[PDB]
Design an enzyme around this catalytic site. Structure first.
Site, PDB file in Angstrom:
ATOM      1  N   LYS B  77      31.439 -39.482  58.464  1.00 43.81           N
ATOM      2  CA  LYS B  77      30.533 -40.147  59.391  1.00 43.81           C
ATOM      3  C   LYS B  77      29.414 -39.215  59.845  1.00 43.81           C
ATOM      4  O   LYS B  77      29.573 -37.995  59.837  1.00 43.81           O
ATOM      5  CB  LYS B  77      31.321 -40.644  60.610  1.00 43.81           C
ATOM      6  CG  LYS B  77      30.510 -41.413  61.641  1.00 43.81           C
ATOM      7  CD  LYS B  77      31.378 -41.879  62.797  1.00 43.81           C
ATOM      8  CE  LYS B  77      30.538 -42.527  63.886  1.00 43.81           C
ATOM      9  NZ  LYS B  77      30.359 -43.988  63.670  1.00 43.81           N
ATOM     10  N   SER B 152      31.781 -49.699  65.478  1.00 40.10           N
ATOM     11  CA  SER B 152      30.641 -48.908  65.028  1.00 40.10           C
ATOM     12  C   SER B 152      30.977 -48.087  63.789  1.00 40.10           C
ATOM     13  O   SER B 152      30.367 -47.048  63.541  1.00 40.10           O
ATOM     14  CB  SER B 152      30.152 -47.984  66.146  1.00 40.10           C
ATOM     15  OG  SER B 152      31.147 -47.044  66.508  1.00 40.10           O
ATOM     16  N   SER B 176      36.136 -49.402  67.598  1.00 42.22           N
ATOM     17  CA  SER B 176      35.048 -49.209  66.648  1.00 42.22           C
ATOM     18  C   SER B 176      35.580 -48.907  65.254  1.00 42.22           C
ATOM     19  O   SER B 176      34.834 -48.485  64.374  1.00 42.22           O
ATOM     20  CB  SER B 176      34.127 -48.082  67.115  1.00 42.22           C
ATOM     21  OG  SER B 176      33.544 -48.388  68.371  1.00 42.22           O
TER      22      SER B 176
END
Lengths: 317, 483, 96
Positions: B77, B152, B176
């Site tokens: 990420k 997310s 998320s």
């Protein structure tokens, strides 16, 4: 006239590594040389509390005869300034390291009065700006340095008493081996919250906070010249406004650095990354045994048991 | 033909001497750069570091040293810092930021023997559950090019589900990871708060943030979690715990395992389709040999507001460091210092992050503090109390993940009401700091939906165990060829 | 429970935000919606109970006074927008 003053003393602890960083403390003219990954406030980086820092902290807490809390949490002092790398200053609002102590301050003219200390928590330093060349340069060499903010109870009165209190703090801390004590190097600093009021009326007499006071002489002269100033201001009436003033020894005048438009909201709240450190009575039990003999009581012990005069005993202690 | 990848089968194949990691990574990268612009799941693809890491993975594989997974292709990420790679979190603010230091998770995984391909798209500082607020573009779902993969961590789920990658690293801040996993039929696991270190991991909510692995099978994310867990002395929030034998915890029977089905997981917000999709799973779990008992959560409904008081607040402090004096992006015309701060923070990101920081500052402001922040924290305490009171008789608490199927793009993205009304069930675990796991239950109108299970502190081995026992009943493996 | 443009203004001043005239109404509306969402919790009584700042009940956090090696000059300025003789260049005047 009644002069009620206060003292906010910042003492720089003599530790090798910084309170949350790993860089060294003592250093010379070389700028930005003491800034690792932690001090640069990089995204994703995290701080870790120093051992000898909190050790010396609760040590000072034990020396000042204060009730040390079992748990203390570091809070955030959110303000924006180029010297401050992150967006908040890691201090202690609620539940400090040390709270409610007393120090026996030695005066002249008979009685040796006792003064109170409301708290003594752990703070952090910021960067330094110098006048050059144009724009400006910020040096984070002193940034990340562990600080001890000894806040005193407003029991302190006259200016001479204040100088005596600063000298006593300096002496006790020097004995504890917490700070170097050399004000010339910029280790021990202090601020004064001086406020006078006419006896009889609790009315009038706004508080004046004079920042950045170096030597004891500077302290005395500034406090006096501020007391009489406030006295005159109340005598004339005029406009009694709250501002943070400063003192320059060259002209012996009081200058206003910033005009306080409103109460600055620093937004205090418990820091979510740092968990509350728990100091058990065993810690204090060991440190109390480690506690050195206090100078104020050692000179009096030099008077009592060993045959000696006040003067030579004091200068010997 | 190399789309059927999984870390177990790949380790088994590499052990069988089929080819080198380099061939695998080159072919897979070939598949990446060709079809990527259709979904835009990746922001940057480092080739030099990838091929270097692949050759090093080969020379390491030669002596078969240090790892269960050797030369496994894994991506990261934009939250996790990486040496040489541009960590940006997917924002205009942190753009052009090459971190001088790596991250504990990336360092550990690479040292274990895992090749990093590049970085995938994510929301701005983990804020939002739609991946539509991305500065680099909205991510598209592999099952529906018109809808969202989630947030997310929509990019990771979309990357792994679309056969691009076998396993990725995701984040958990307020649900998320479970939502994107559910919208893309994936298995997402969140460890207990303090298990996975946060050093190098840029914080959005310090007391809520927690990094967890995202993969296709429970075995895979078990293999990842077994590596990415553990204590780190550089991190203060990390906790010391020796249990790290997840791989061996598998194949343990569900003989007389109590399962809790909350009443509050059955309300007016969830559709009947997913409800049946859950009850089928509960019945199947009963067939597996597990027992089910009704449990209660009095303060489960009150989980939604408190979160959006705690998470923004911390953020409003956590993002205070982003001023542009030391790094990131700096103003073109800085008239003043105050102008520097305000303009730099203005041209960071648009409305979402800015407004959430606003609500956070309003929550932390003098006066409103006790009424909002303290209130939310005490409610959080009540939630923790409800959980520790509930788990006294129940071992694992199961229910539905997302209450609504995937919603299309260009609709209620400007409107936050629907955005907040999405994450209702998934935030309770985050507030309580409990380990959770989302595993797909089935398909609704061609769209995948998942079921969330929650477990008590420091025993993720059990949740992945029931997960593995669940892996035996119904497998959805042959889904890769379509997309 | 309610907000005016000046409340949003002061909040903007606190968290340092650049806001134009066109962005004001929408921001006020969305913010008011958010506050309208959070306000539901006030109905629940919170007497006696204590707050929860951290999920886990952890204790002491000590780090020995061990000095770690220092990096070189070049690694810092590679991302830094402003640099002069190893210092960050920043405007001094602060007003309005």
């Amino acid at each position: 006239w009644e002069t009620v003053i206060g003292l906010e003393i910042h003492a720089q602890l003599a530790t090798q590594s910084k309170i949350f960083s790993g860089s060294s403390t003592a250093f010379g003219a070389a700028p930005n040389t003491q800034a690792s990954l932690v001090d640069l406030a990089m995204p994703g980086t995290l701080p870790v509390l120093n051992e000898e820092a909190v050790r010396m902290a609760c040590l000072f807490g034990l020396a000042i005869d204060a009730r040390i809390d079992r748990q203390n949490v570091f809070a955030r002092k959110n303000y924006f300034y180029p010297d401050l790398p992150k967006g908040y200053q890691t201090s202690q609002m609620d539940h400090p390291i040390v709270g409610k102590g007393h120090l026996d301050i030695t005066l002249e003219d008979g009685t040796t009065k006792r003064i109170g200390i409301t708290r003594a928590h752990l703070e952090e330093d910021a960067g330094k700006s110098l006048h050059e060349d144009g724009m400006s340069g910020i040096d984070l060499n002193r940034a990340g340095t562990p600080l001890l903010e000894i806040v005193s109870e407003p029991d302190i009165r006259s200016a001479k008493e204040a100088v005596a209190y600063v000298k006593a703090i300096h002496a006790l801390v020097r004995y504890l081996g917490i700070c170097d004590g050399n004000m010339a190097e910029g280790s021990l600093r202090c601020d004064c919250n001086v406020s006078v009021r006419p006896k009889g009326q609790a009315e009038f007499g706004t508080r004046a906070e004079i920042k950045n006071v170096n030597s004891f002489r500077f302290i005395e002269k500034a406090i006096n010249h501020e007391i009489q100033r406030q006295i005159e201001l109340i005598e004339d009436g005029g406009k009694v406004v709250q501002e943070t003033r400063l003192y320059d020894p060259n002209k012996d005048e009081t200058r206003s650095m910033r005009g306080k438009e409103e109460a600055n909201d620093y937004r205090y709240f418990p820091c979510p990354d740092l968990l509350p450190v728990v100091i058990e009575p065993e810690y204090l039990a060991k440190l109390r045994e480690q506690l050195p003999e206090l100078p104020v009581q050692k000179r009096e012990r030099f008077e009592s048991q060993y045959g000696l005069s006040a003067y030579d005993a004091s200068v010997l202690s | 033909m190399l789309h059927q990848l999984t870390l177990a089968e790949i380790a088994r194949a590499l052990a069988d001497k089929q080819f080198s990691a380099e061939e695998l990574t080159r072919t897979l990268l070939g598949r990446i750069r060709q079809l990527d612009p259709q979904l835009n799941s990746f922001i940057s693809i480092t080739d030099d570091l990838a091929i270097a890491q692949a050759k090093a993975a080969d020379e390491r594989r030669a002596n078969g040293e240090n790892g269960a997974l050797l030369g496994a292709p894994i991506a990261h990420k934009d939250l996790f810092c990486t040496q040489g790679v541009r960590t940006s979190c997917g924002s205009k603010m942190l753009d052009n930021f090459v971190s001088p230091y790596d991250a504990t998770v990336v360092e550990k995984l690479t040292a274990a023997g895992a090749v990093t391909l590049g970085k995938l798209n994510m929301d701005e500082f983990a804020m939002g559950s739609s991946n539509q607020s991305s500065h680099y573009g909205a991510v598209k779902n592999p099952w529906s090019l018109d809808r969202v993969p989630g947030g997310s961590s929509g990019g990771s789920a979309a990357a792994v589900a679309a056969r691009l990658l076998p396993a990725a690293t995701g984040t958990d801040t307020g649900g998320s990871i479970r939502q994107p996993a559910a919208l893309t039929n994936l298995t997402g696991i969140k460890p207990t708060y303090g298990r996975v270190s946060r050093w190098g991991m840029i914080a959005y909510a310090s007391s809520l943030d927690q990094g967890g692995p995202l993969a296709r099978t429970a075995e895979d994310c078990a293999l990842m979690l077994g590596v990415m867990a553990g204590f780190d002395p550089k991190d203060s929030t990390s906790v010391e715990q020796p249990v790290d034998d997840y791989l061996a915890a598998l194949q343990k029977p569900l003989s007389g395992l109590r399962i809790g089905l909350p009443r509050e997981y059955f309300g007016a917000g969830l559709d009947s389709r997913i409800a049946d999709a859950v009850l089928a799973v509960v019945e199947e779990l009963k067939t597996l040999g597990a027992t089910v008992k009704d449990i209660s959560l009095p303060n489960m409904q009150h989980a939604i507001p408190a979160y959006y008081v705690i998470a923004p607040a911390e953020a409003s402090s956590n993002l205070s460091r982003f001023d542009g004096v030391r790094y990131g992006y700096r103003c073109d015309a800085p008239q003043n210092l105050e102008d520097l701060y305000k303009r730099s923070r203005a041209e960071g990101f648009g409305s979402e992050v800015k407004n959430r920081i606003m609500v956070g500052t309003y929550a932390l402001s003098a006066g409103y503090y006790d009424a909002y922040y303290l209130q939310a924290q005490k409610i959080r305490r009540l939630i923790k109390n409800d959980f520790v009171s509930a788990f006294a008789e129940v071992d694992v608490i199961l229910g539905p993940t997302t209450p609504n199927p995937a919603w299309k793009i260009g609709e209620k993205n400007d409107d936050p009401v629907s955005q907040y009304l999405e994450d209702i069930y998934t935030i309770t675990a985050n507030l309580a700091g409990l380990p959770g796991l989302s595993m797909p239950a089935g398909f609704v109108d061609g769209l995948p939906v998942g079921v969330q299970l929650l477990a008590p502190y420091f025993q993720e081995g059990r949740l992945l165990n029931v997960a593995h026992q669940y892996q035996q009943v119904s497998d959805w493996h042959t889904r890769t060829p379509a997309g | 429970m309610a907000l005016e443009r000046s409340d949003v203004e002061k909040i903007a001043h606190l968290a340092r935000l650049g806001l134009s005239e066109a962005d004001l109404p929408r921001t006020t509306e969305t913010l008011n919606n958010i506050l309208g969402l959070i306000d539901q919790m006030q109905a629940v009584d919170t007497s006696g109970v204590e707050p929860l700042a951290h999920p886990l009940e952890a204790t002491q956090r000590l780090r020995p006074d061990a000095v770690t090696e220092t990096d070189h000059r070049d690694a810092y300025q590679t991302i830094a927008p402003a640099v002069e003789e190893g210092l960050y260049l920043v405007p001094k005047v602060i007003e309005s």
